[PDB]
Design a binder for this molecule. Structure first.
Ligand SMILES: *[C@@H]1O[C@H](CO)[C@@H](O[C@@H]2O[C@H](CO)[C@@H](O)[C@H](O)[C@H]2NC(C)=O)[C@H](O)[C@H]1NC(C)=O
Ligand SMILES: *[C@@H]1O[C@H](CO)[C@@H](O[C@@H]2O[C@H](CO)[C@@H](O)[C@H](O)[C@H]2NC(C)=O)[C@H](O)[C@H]1NC(C)=O
Ligand SMILES: *[C@@H]1O[C@H](CO)[C@@H](O[C@@H]2O[C@H](CO)[C@@H](O)[C@H](O)[C@H]2NC(C)=O)[C@H](O)[C@H]1NC(C)=O
Ligand SMILES: *[C@@H]1O[C@H](CO)[C@@H](O[C@@H]2O[C@H](CO)[C@@H](O)[C@H](O)[C@H]2NC(C)=O)[C@H](O)[C@H]1NC(C)=O
Ligand SMILES: *[C@@H]1O[C@H](CO)[C@@H](O[C@@H]2O[C@H](CO)[C@@H](O)[C@H](O)[C@H]2NC(C)=O)[C@H](O)[C@H]1NC(C)=O
Ligand SMILES: *[C@@H]1O[C@H](CO)[C@@H](O[C@@H]2O[C@H](CO)[C@@H](O)[C@H](O)[C@H]2NC(C)=O)[C@H](O)[C@H]1NC(C)=O
Ligand SMILES: *[C@@H]1O[C@H](CO)[C@@H](O[C@@H]2O[C@H](CO)[C@@H](O)[C@H](O)[C@H]2NC(C)=O)[C@H](O)[C@H]1NC(C)=O
Ligand SMILES: *[C@@H]1O[C@H](CO)[C@@H](O)[C@H](O)[C@H]1NC(C)=O
Ligand SMILES: *[C@@H]1O[C@H](CO)[C@@H](O)[C@H](O)[C@H]1NC(C)=O
Ligand SMILES: *[C@@H]1O[C@H](CO)[C@@H](O)[C@H](O)[C@H]1NC(C)=O
Ligand SMILES: *[C@@H]1O[C@H](CO)[C@@H](O)[C@H](O)[C@H]1NC(C)=O
Ligand SMILES: *[C@@H]1O[C@H](CO)[C@@H](O)[C@H](O)[C@H]1NC(C)=O
Lengths: 99, 86, 366, 35, 244, 49, 50, 34, 50
């Protein structure tokens, strides 16, 4: 009740997930070498034949960022699954019987 | 990626089936999370109930055994844990 | 749709994600300021005299409505080349601080006016930035800007210590030492005048007749809009999923009356993650509130094509207020996971067959 | 080196050897009771 | 029509601590309950700010001018390169009525003053003004600390202002107060120096107690905190201390 | 990537934050290594002789 | 076009760095599993009879 | 102070030995007392 | 002689064979050079960073 910061692991997990989401959503504001970071402005200033050039850069940058996010999520999920298996064994052994 | 633009969708369509794979990975992650919780906690077949009279040889479990006053039927320690972490 | 997504003619019992649903826009609205005064273009385009290339005439124009269409369709311009924008859309954008640079050059130097271009004019008389946005206009003037007596008032810079800066003016007229001896204001050996005149004559052929060149340069969202183009402004609509064109900023959503405390110098608000959240209409000066239209994912619940052919639909995280093919179907259920159509709620409790969420799930009997 | 560096471990080798020595002395003298 | 001043109050200027003054709104975008990091020209924290009790001072990049003046002795400013008719110059005056902004090639004097007849009409700053380019009139600006920030970027002259009654006697107050933008000018000049104008009592001038503070801006990065109502309430200077 | 070139740094600047998370991952790995050694070896309250 | 050439070099080097980081992460996970096994073995077989 | 991990400024080197709370490296670490 | 780079140069004792101009060890990292005039072996090490 009195002393705080005794639950560092769960707080760290929450912080990691929140940070991943935050950087993923912040990545949307990058030019990636194009003339703007918003699609409507590009579509409202340029004809298609020159517009696809910028849209390609936007697409490749955003897609690469998405793949990085997915890979990080996969690694973290594997670690969490290992921890969950350990917790299940501990509950089966130290609660349902005397270890 | 596209934000509800037809031209972006048409350009992206020629990149293959990346998005199906991306969605499949996340779906696998979610199913894994549900299975994790279920296999950790669902260890008993029946929901037992404590007797109304509590005389366990002098041991006092009131701080852990659930309190009916709480709407969520939780206990004192569980309430403290839930309040402690955001 | 489930069969198409699974690439099979048979589907086993389970829950599958298929696609997403979105509310579609209904009508369009445009809001531009009341300003309607015409913009002076023929005053500078039909100007009698143009200064020299090293002293290029610079003009700033703002607070007007400019019609580029009459400039676009006119064939009097021999060269009409824009860089950052397609010309046909110049009537759809409102800018601020339009800059016009006018001068007269030889026939063969028009090519040198371009970003990332190297030559004589391109580095000693007039430089354009690499990321320049705008347009360049060129037309022949051999009829009036060429004199049979020889046009010598037109001069260009010929020597300098180093190359110029973009949009930088050099007017200094000092002797240049080409060698290792001081000049002391004497145009002798290894000393030269940086300015060289021209020999514009009507008898000269192409590439030597005088040509008038004017460049127009713009900006993109650096101040409240002051110079617009010809476009009618419609009425304002509230609480309707519509696409808007507020002062050149386009988007789609619903507009709500907002109580955000703007201060008399802001023009539009913004929130975390850099999303345009609130705008102030030019004609009324009212602070609005943008909100994206309702959207979400859809999922299908089926007991398996082996058993039956009737399914249920779940709209994820959507209130049972904006449903609209299963407009009515069966009784509609509202759950913490969203809204559910095609299944009947009961107050019994069995084992979970097809997990749905928030502790509830569905099964086949209907 | 081309922008890459190697950081030393927090525990030096002497401390690890000291842990092992303490463990082994404890298990020789006190059996499993010291755990 | 002007006379040279004979009283030479020549003495080294004073120095004092800037504390955390000179923070202004960098952009025209509303925000709320968000911490924003921005890089621009600012006044470095705890800097050495000059104190005067009317010499020529270089403009540098930006200028922060503050005065805890009483009865509004200060009138205006002059900006330019050589402050003569050979080069374009800018002139700001805030008299009793609307403020006047001018851009011409004036012929200034060595001691630009105003003189006040107790009938308050006298103008002895410049003798001639042949070529005028820009004019402007606005609302008048005016125990009471008044702060102004002057910037000249991209053919734009930006003026920020902020006034607040004060109770401290001499030193600059140790408080925080953002500076909302006041006025913008779409004029491009090659300004390098500036002056200051006074309102002496021509009744026989008596004006020696003119205390004001002058500081210069440098490019750096700040971290600004916005409140719920969209008002800047605190800031952190990046390159000042390792903790920063 | 750039090797002390200003133009390269400016060009790399417009890729967003592709470098904060790389260093974050590497630092996490290093802290994990230290924790691994500490938890495998430090298991006695005193140093016996 | 120096910008174009530098962009090609930049994207190549960035891809290589990403690959290296991912491989490091995989190897670190494996080593952590090994270290956990070592800790359990040492706790169970050195401090007591198994 | 010069350490196997590098150089340290703003900290005083002592001849005592305490429990470690803010790790630095190479078997040394710092704490607040100064 | 057209090979450019930043670092600090000291005296070195490596014996170049009389027709080389510079040396490298692994992954094409130049370590020694021979000055075109005095014809002596200099050793290059990177400027410190951290
Ligand atoms: C078990 O312990 C709890 C406290 O953790 C006891 O509850 C206390 O009872 C006394 C006597 O009525 C009260 O004065 C306290 O305020 C109670 N504590 C709380 C937190 O409410 C409880 O009585 C103990 N069990 C038995 C059988 O005595
Ligand atoms: C410059 O003057 C010419 C006139 O010689 C303009 O050309 C004509 O302008 C009138 C204006 O009422 C139009 O009705 C004609 O259609 C224009 N073309 C012709 C062939 O007569 C020209 O428009 C002026 N320049 C600008 C920029 O307005
Ligand atoms: C779906 O929309 C309805 C209609 O707005 C919501 O019902 C409102 O609930 C609020 C909060 O209790 C009340 O103040 C309103 O009076 C209700 N409106 C009506 C017409 O009764 C409902 O809460 C929404 N569902 C969800 C999950 O948000
Ligand atoms: C702005 O004005 C200053 C003078 O107030 C100019 O500085 C002069 O620069 C030239 C060229 O280097 C020197 O020969 C002069 O001696 C300088 N004058 C002084 C008083 O030092 C400056 O060049 C001007 N800037 C622009 C862009 O024209
Ligand atoms: C005021 O402006 C006029 C015109 O802009 C200047 O008169 C010019 O003076 C130069 C001096 O060499 C002459 O070469 C020009 O021919 C003159 N132009 C005209 C139209 O007469 C005048 O010098 C300016 N006054 C100043 C700068 O004090
Ligand atoms: C303050 O300065 C102004 C301008 O130098 C003086 O003249 C006024 O100028 C404005 C500009 O259009 C006019 O609208 C006013 O009618 C003018 N007169 C007044 C009384 O404002 C003005 O006289 C000066 N005021 C004082 C008290 O000296
Ligand atoms: C921020 O805005 C809120 C909303 O107006 C202020 O809260 C009240 O504001 C009114 C003025 O419209 C005052 O009359 C009230 O006294 C305020 N309520 C209080 C102070 O409890 C609030 O004062 C503003 N400032 C801050 C720092 O929150
Ligand atoms: C724009 O015009 C309308 C109609 O004349 C008027 O109601 C509105 O107040 C005007 N806007 C401004 C800012 O004056
Ligand atoms: C599934 O299909 C098989 C035929 O392939 C049938 O024998 C079986 O009864 C079906 N199961 C159902 C409908 O539950
Ligand atoms: C639903 O609940 C009501 C009372 O809450 C009960 O009477 C009824 O039997 C339950 N089941 C159905 C199918 O209505
Ligand atoms: C400002 O500079 C003067 C130089 O005379 C110096 O004495 C004074 O201490 C400085 N101020 C601060 C706050 O360091
Ligand atoms: C205490 O430490 C200092 C440096 O930290 C050292 O110079 C001094 O010799 C030490 N004293 C003893 C008694 O070891």
């Amino acid at each position: 009740s009195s002393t705080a910061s005794a639950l560092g692991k769960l707080q760290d997990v929450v912080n990691q997930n929140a940070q991943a989401l935050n950087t993923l959503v912040k990545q949307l504001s990058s030019n990636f070498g194009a003339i703007s970071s918003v699609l409507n402005d590009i579509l409202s200033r340029l004809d298609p034949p020159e517009a696809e050039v910028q849209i390609d850069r936007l697409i490749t940058g955003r897609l690469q960022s998405l793949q990085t996010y997915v890979t990080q999520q996969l690694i973290r999920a594997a670690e969490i699954r290992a921890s969950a298996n350990l917790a299940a064994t501990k509950m089966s052994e130290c609660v349902l019987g005397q270890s | 990626i596209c934000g509800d633009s037809t031209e972006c969708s048409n350009l992206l369509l020629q990149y293959g089936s990346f998005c199906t794979q991306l969605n499949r990975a996340l779906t696998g992650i979610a199913v894994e999370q549900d299975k994790n919780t279920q296999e950790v906690f669902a260890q008993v077949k029946q929901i037992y109930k404590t007797p109304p009279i509590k005389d366990f040889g002098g041991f006092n479990f009131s701080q852990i055994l659930p309190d009916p006053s709480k709407p969520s039927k939780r206990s004192f320690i569980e309430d403290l844990l839930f309040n402690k972490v955001t | 749709e489930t069969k198409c997504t699974l690439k099979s003619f048979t589907v086993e019992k389970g829950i599958y994600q298929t696609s997403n649903f979105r509310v579609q826009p209904t009508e369009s609205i445009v809001r531009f300021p009341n300003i309607t005064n015409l913009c002076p273009f023929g005053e500078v385009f039909n100007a009698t005299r143009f200064a020299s290339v090293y002293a290029w005439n610079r003009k700033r124009i703002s607070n007007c409505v400019a019609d580029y269409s009459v400039l676009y369709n006119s064939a009097s311009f021999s060269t009409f080349k824009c860089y950052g924008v397609s010309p046909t859309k110049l009537n759809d954008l409102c800018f601020t601080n339009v800059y016009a640079d006018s001068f007269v050059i030889r026939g063969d130097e028009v090519r040198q006016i371009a970003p990332g271009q190297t030559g004589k004019i391109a580095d000693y008389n007039y430089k354009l930035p690499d990321d320049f946005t705008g347009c360049v206009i060129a037309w022949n003037s051999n009829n009036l800007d060429s004199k049979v007596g020889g046009n010598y008032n037109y001069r260009y810079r010929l020597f300098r210590k180093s190359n110029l800066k973009p949009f930088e003016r050099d007017i200094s007229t000092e002797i240049y030492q080409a060698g290792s001896t001081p000049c002391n204001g004497v145009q002798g050996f290894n000393c030269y005048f940086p300015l060289q005149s021209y020999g514009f004559q009507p008898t000269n052929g192409v590439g030597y007749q005088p040509y008038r060149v004017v460049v127009l340069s713009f900006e993109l969202l650096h101040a409240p809009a002051t110079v617009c183009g010809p476009k009618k402004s419609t009425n304002l609509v509230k609480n309707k999923c519509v696409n808007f064109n507020f002062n050149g900023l386009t988007g789609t959503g619903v507009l709500t009356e907002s109580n955000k405390k703007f201060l008399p110098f802001q023009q539009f608000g913004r929130d975390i993650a850099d999303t345009t959240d609130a705008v102030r209409d030019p004609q009324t000066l009212e602070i609005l509130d943008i909100t994206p239209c309702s959207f979400g994912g859809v999922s299908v619940i089926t007991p398996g094509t082996n058993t039956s052919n009737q399914v249920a639909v779940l709209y994820q995280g959507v209130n049972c207020t904006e449903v609209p093919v299963y407009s009515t179907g069966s009784n509609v259920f509202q759950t913490r996971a969203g809204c559910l159509i095609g299944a009947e709620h009961v107050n019994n409790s069995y084992e979970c067959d097809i997990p749905i969420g928030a502790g509830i799930c569905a099964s086949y009997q209907s | 080196f081309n922008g890459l560096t190697v950081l030393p471990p927090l525990l030096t080798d002497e401390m690890i050897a000291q842990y092992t020595s303490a463990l082994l002395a404890g298990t020789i003298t006190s059996g499993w009771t010291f755990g | 029509q002007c006379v040279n001043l004979t009283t030479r109050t020549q003495l080294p200027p004073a120095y004092t601590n800037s504390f955390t003054r000179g923070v202004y709104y960098p952009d025209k975008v509303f925000r709320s309950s968000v911490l924003h990091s921005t890089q621009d020209l600012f006044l470095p924290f705890f800097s050495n700010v000059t104190w005067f009790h009317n010499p020529v001072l270089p403009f540098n990049d930006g200028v922060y001018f503050a005065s805890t003046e009483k009865s509004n002795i200060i009138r205006g400013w002059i900006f330019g390169t050589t402050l003569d008719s050979k080069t374009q110059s800018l002139l700001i005056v805030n008299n009793a009525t609307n403020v006047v902004i001018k851009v011409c090639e004036f012929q200034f004097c060595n001691d630009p003053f105003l003189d006040v007849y107790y009938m308050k009409s006298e103008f002895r700053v410049y003798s001639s003004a042949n070529n005028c380019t820009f004019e402007y009139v606005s609302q008048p600006f005016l125990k009471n600390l008044r702060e102004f920030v002057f910037k000249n970027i991209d053919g734009y002259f930006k003026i920020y202002s902020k006034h607040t009654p004060i109770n401290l006697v001499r030193d600059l107050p140790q408080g925080f107060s953002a500076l909302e933008p006041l006025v913008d000018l779409p004029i491009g000049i090659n300004i390098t120096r500036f002056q200051t104008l006074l309102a002496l009592h021509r009744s026989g001038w008596t004006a020696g107690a003119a205390a004001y503070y002058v500081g210069y801006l440098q490019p750096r990065t700040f971290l600004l905190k916005y409140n719920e109502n969209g008002t800047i309430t605190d800031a952190v200077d990046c390159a000042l201390d390792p903790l920063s």
